[PDB]
C-alpha cells in the first residue's frame, strides 16, 4: 500500500564509463582486395550491411578525447600489426657489408649533394661458398660513411637489426570500424561544435564506429574526417604551450605528391629462399620528389584557422607561423606513405606567414628514406622495397598538428609551429566523438507491489 517494496528490473538504460577489448570491422569489399592479406583485414569481422544509430533523446553525456582509451587501444593494435606483418618477411641480416658507393650518373652541379648513392658490395649467394659482386642504389639518408674510395654502410647497422618488407603486402590505409562486444556500447557525439571535452547535447549510440583509416603521418593530417561549419580547434590545455593543438578542417586542401623517378627493381638472390630487392639504374631524368598545394586553397584555409585562433588568444592579436625548431627527420618534416615509399617533405612553405588582427601551386621539397624506424621503435628496422615506375598520389589535408612557443611576451603575439612525434594524437582526431561504456541492466526500484505467500 503506502509502504513501498523493491522490484528488480532487467533491461534498464543504465551505463557507466569503462574500458574493454574492442574488435574490428572492415566492410566486405575490402576483403575482396586480397593480395595475400593487405595490412590487417584477414580474420576481421565483416561490417554490418545496415548499421543502426540510435539517437538518445534528452541524454547529455560528457566526453573526453584526451582521456579516451580507444586511442591507446588502437595505437597498440597498429604497432602489433606492424610486427606481425614483418615476422614471416625476409631478414636482411647480411646486408651490413661494406658499401663501395659513388654518385649517381648525372651532370653536376656541386649543389646537387649526390643524395643518390651507387653502392657496390659483396653478397652471399644460394651456396655457402662463392660470393656475389652486385650493386644497388641507396639514398643518402639510408647510408653513412665510415673511416682508397668512399666506403659506406647501412644507417641502421649500428643501431639495430633489419628486415625487408614483403612485396606482397601493401601499406594502403583501409577503413577500420571499431566495435564493442555484447553488454557494451559506443556513444557518439553528434553536435556540429564540440572540442572533444565536456557535456554533449546530442548523443547517440552505435555498435561500430565509422570507417577510420589508420593513416600514419606527421604535421599534416591526411585523409581524415572534415569538421562541420567552422574549422575546429582542440587542445588538452591551451594555456600550456607544451600541449599540442589538433586542428580539424572544414574544406579539404588538395595535395599532390609524386616520385619523378622510373626506378628499377633488381632481385639479387641471397638464397636459399630469401631474396633482396635492390634498386637498379634509373630510367630517365634525375628528379626529386615533391608535393603541391594550391596557393589559393591554402591561403583561405590558413586564414580561416587564424580567425578561430583569435577566439582563444585575444581578439586583437598577431599570429605568426614558423617552421619546426629541429630534431628528428620524422618531426621536422611531413612524414607519410604514398605508393609504398616513405616521403619526408619540407614544410617551410606552408608555415611561412604572419597574420595581423585584420594562381599556381606550392611545391615542397620531399626526401625519400627506405630504412625506417617509426613509432620510436628500436630493434625493428624495416627496409621498404623499391617501387617500379613513377608514383603519384592525391590526398586530403584535413588537419594540422601545431605547437606554441614559450617565448613570452604573452599578451602581445603568439607563434605556432608544426609538431607531432606521438602518433597517438593522429587517432584522437577521429576518436574524439567516441567513448566506451558498459551496460548494467540490473536496477532496483520501489513500488507498491508485493508478491505471493
Amino acid at each position: 500500500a503506502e509502504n513501498l517494496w523493491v522490484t528488480v528490473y532487467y533491461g534498464v538504460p543504465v551505463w557507466k564509463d569503462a574500458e574493454t577489448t574492442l574488435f574490428c570491422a572492415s566492410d566486405a569489399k575490402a576483403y575482396e582486395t586480397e593480395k595475400h592479406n593487405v595490412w590487417a583485414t584477414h580474420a576481421c569481422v565483416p561490417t554490418d550491411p545496415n548499421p543502426q544509430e540510435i539517437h538518445l533523446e534528452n541524454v547529455t553525456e560528457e566526453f573526453n578525447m584526451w582521456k579516451n582509451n580507444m586511442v591507446e587501444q588502437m595505437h597498440t593494435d597498429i604497432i602489433s600489426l606492424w610486427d606481425q606483418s614483418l615476422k614471416p618477411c625476409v631478414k636482411l641480416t647480411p646486408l651490413c657489408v661494406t658499401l663501395q658507393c659513388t654518385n649517381v650518373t648525372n651532370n653536376i652541379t656541386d649543389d646537387m649533394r649526390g643524395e643518390l648513392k651507387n653502392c657496390s658490395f659483396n653478397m652471399t649467394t644460394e651456396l655457402r661458398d662463392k660470393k656475389q659482386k652486385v650493386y644497388s642504389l641507396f639514398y643518402r639518408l639510408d647510408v653513412v660513411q665510415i673511416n682508397s674510395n668512399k666506403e659506406y654502410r647501412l644507417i641502421n647497422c649500428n643501431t639495430s637489426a633489419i628486415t625487408q618488407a614483403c612485396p606482397k603486402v601493401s601499406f594502403e590505409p583501409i577503413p577500420i570500424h571499431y566495435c564493442a562486444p555484447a553488454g557494451f556500447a559506443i556513444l557518439k557525439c553528434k553536435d556540429k561544435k564540440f572540442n572533444g571535452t565536456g557535456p554533449c547535447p546530442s548523443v547517440s549510440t552505435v555498435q561500430c564506429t565509422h570507417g577510420i583509416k589508420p593513416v600514419v603521418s606527421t604535421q599534416l593530417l591526411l585523409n581524415g574526417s572534415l569538421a562541420e561549419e567552422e574549422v575546429m580547434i582542440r587542445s588538452e590545455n591551451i594555456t600550456n604551450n607544451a600541449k599540442n593543438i589538433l586542428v580539424q578542417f572544414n574544406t579539404p586542401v588538395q595535395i599532390n605528391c609524386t616520385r619523378p623517378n622510373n626506378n628499377t627493381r633488381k632481385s639479387i638472390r641471397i638464397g636459399p629462399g630469401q631474396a633482396f630487392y635492390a634498386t637498379g639504374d634509373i630510367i630517365g631524368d634525375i628528379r626529386q620528389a615533391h608535393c603541391n598545394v594550391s596557393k589559393a586553397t591554402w591561403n583561405e584555409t590558413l586564414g580561416k584557422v587564424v580567425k578561430q585562433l583569435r577566439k582563444h588568444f585575444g581578439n586583437n592579436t598577431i599570429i605568426r607561423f614558423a617552421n619546426s625548431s629541429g630534431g628528428d627527420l620524422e618531426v621536422t618534416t611531413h612524414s607519410f606513405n604514398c605508393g609504398g615509399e616513405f616521403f619526408y617533405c619540407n614544410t617551410s612553405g606552408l608555415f611561412n606567414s604572419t597574420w595581423i588582427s585584420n594562381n599556381d601551386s606550392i611545391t615542397l621539397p620531399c626526401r625519400i628514406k627506405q630504412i625506417i624506424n617509426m613509432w620510436q621503435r628500436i630493434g625493428q628496422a624495416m627496409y621498404a622495397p623499391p617501387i617500379q615506375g613513377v608514383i603519384r598520389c592525391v590526398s586530403n589535408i584535413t588537419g594540422l598538428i601545431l605547437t606554441r612557443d614559450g617565448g613570452s611576451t604573452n599578451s602581445t603575439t603568439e607563434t605556432f609551429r608544426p609538431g607531432g612525434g606521438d602518433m597517438r594524437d593522429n587517432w584522437r582526431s577521429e576518436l574524439y566523438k567516441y567513448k566506451v561504456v558498459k551496460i548494467e541492466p540490473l536496477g532496483v526500484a520501489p513500488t507498491r507491489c508485493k508478491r505471493r505467500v
Binding site: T7, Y10, V12, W15, T20, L22, L56, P181, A182, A445
Partner: protein, 126 residues
C-alpha cells in the same frame, strides 16, 4: 513506438520501463588479432550469466520485472512514487542508490529465496 537500444535513456523510469525488452535483446547478441574478439565475447557471456545468476537466486528468475518482499528503507533516498517514475531517469536514479546497491542485493538473495523456498518445503509436505 520503438526508440531502439538504450532509447529511453533520457526518459523517466516509468517511461523507460516500457523499453525493458529492448535493452535485454541486444545484450547478448547471438593467429593474433582474432583472439582479440574471442577473449571479449567470452567475457560477454560471463557478464550475462553473472546478472542472470543474481536474477535467479533472487525471487525473480523470470526476467524483465518481478516483485520482492523487501520493505524500502527510507535511508535509501526517500522519494515518492510519483517523484521517481515521473521525474527521474534511470541514469540519475542509479547515481543515488549506488551507495546502497550492494546492501539491497544481500536482502534479496539471502533473506528471501533461502527463507521463502525453505518455508515452501514445509507448506508442500502437508
Amino acid at each position: 513506438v520503438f526508440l531502439g537500444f538504450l532509447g529511453a535513456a533520457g526518459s523517466t523510469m516509468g517511461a523507460a520501463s516500457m523499453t525493458l525488452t529492448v535493452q535485454a535483446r541486444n545484450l547478448l547478441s547471438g593467429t593474433v588479432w582474432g583472439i582479440k574478439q574471442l577473449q571479449a565475447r567470452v567475457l560477454a557471456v560471463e557478464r550475462y550469466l553473472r546478472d542472470q545468476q543474481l536474477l535467479g537466486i533472487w525471487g525473480c528468475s523470470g526476467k524483465l520485472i518481478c516483485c520482492t518482499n523487501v520493505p524500502w528503507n527510507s535511508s535509501w533516498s526517500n522519494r515518492n512514487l510519483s517523484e521517481i517514475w515521473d521525474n527521474m531517469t534511470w541514469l540519475q536514479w542509479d547515481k543515488e542508490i549506488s551507495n546502497y546497491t550492494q546492501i539491497i542485493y544481500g536482502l534479496l538473495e539471502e533473506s528471501q529465496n533461502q527463507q521463502e523456498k525453505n518455508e515452501q518445503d514445509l507448506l508442500a509436505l502437508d
